[PDB]
From a paper:
CCs are quaternary structures comprising two or more α-helices supercoiled around each other with cyclic (Cn) or dihedral (Dn) symmetry. Here, we describe variants with all combinations of the aliphatic residues, Ile, Leu and Val, at a and d to give four classes of peptide: the ββ class, with a and d = Ile or Val; Lβ, a = Leu and d = Ile or Val; βL, a = Ile or Val and d = Leu; and LL, a = d = Leu. Peptides are named systematically appending the one-letter code for the amino acids at the a and d sites to “CC-Type2-“; e.g., CC-Hept becomes CC-Type2-LI. In summary, solution-phase data and X-ray crystal structures demonstrate conclusively that different classes of Type-2 coiled-coil (CC) peptides—i.e., based on abcdefg repeats with predominantly hydrophobic residues at a, d, e and g—adopt a range of distinct states.
As a = d = β-branched specify blunt-ended α-helical barrels, we explored all four combinations of Ile and Val at these sites. CC-Type2-VV, -IV, -VI and -II, were helical and bound DPH in solution consistent with α-helical barrels. Interestingly, X-ray crystallography revealed that oligomer state increased through this series: CC-Type2-VV was hexameric; CC-Type2-IV, heptameric; and CC-Type2-II, octameric. Concomitantly, the dimensions of the internal pore diameters increased: VV, 4.8–7.7 Å; IV, 6.2–9.2 Å; and II, 9.0–11.0 Å. Finally, the modelling offers a clear explanation for why the ββ and Lβ classes exclusively form non-collapsed Cn-symmetric α-helical barrels. Sequences from both classes scored worse when threaded onto most of the slipped and collapsed structures (upper-right-hand regions of Fig. 7e). More specifically, by disfavouring alternative states, potential steric clashes involving β-branched Ile residues at a and d appear critical for maintaining parallel α-helical-barrels structures.
Author numbering:
A (entry chain B), B (entry chain A), C (entry chain C), D (entry chain C), E (entry chain A), F (entry chain B): 1 to 30
Amino acid sequence: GEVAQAVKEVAKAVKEVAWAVKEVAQAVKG
Amino acid sequence: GEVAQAVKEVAKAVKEVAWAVKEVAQAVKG
Amino acid sequence: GEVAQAVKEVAKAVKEVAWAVKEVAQAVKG
Amino acid sequence: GEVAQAVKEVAKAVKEVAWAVKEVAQAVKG
Amino acid sequence: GEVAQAVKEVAKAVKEVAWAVKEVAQAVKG
Amino acid sequence: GEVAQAVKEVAKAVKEVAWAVKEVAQAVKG
């Protein structure tokens, strides 16, 4: 359980990277 | 099982990063 | 415990990637 | 075994990110 | 212990990605 | 052991991402 919860924290952080990359794409378009 | 399922959630989030990066490439080309 | 703590260190490093990507977006906009 | 196989799926997804970043580099150069 | 040490190697590699992204930001600004 | 070896494969792939990001920085400079 404790290991699985820490791994889920990694998944959440990776999703934050994906959103930041989408921000870059929008800045390039603009 | 519980840990393996959480690791698979990380793999899915990483694929979302890959798609966001492809969106940057398309914005550069456009 | 020790494995979970190492995984949390990965999560923190991933958040640092997200902030660096945000800096790229601001540089492109500027 | 099952945890190791899930971790290998993460490794493959990370390689797909690397290729997408290479596409950005080619788009910038072009 | 062996698994925790390998996870710490991932954290170090992620920090190397963060620095490479900062180099992109500097190149854009320059 | 088997889990640790799979985690080391992830670290190697993350380093490949860092190198690809450096390629982007060089393309921007050029």
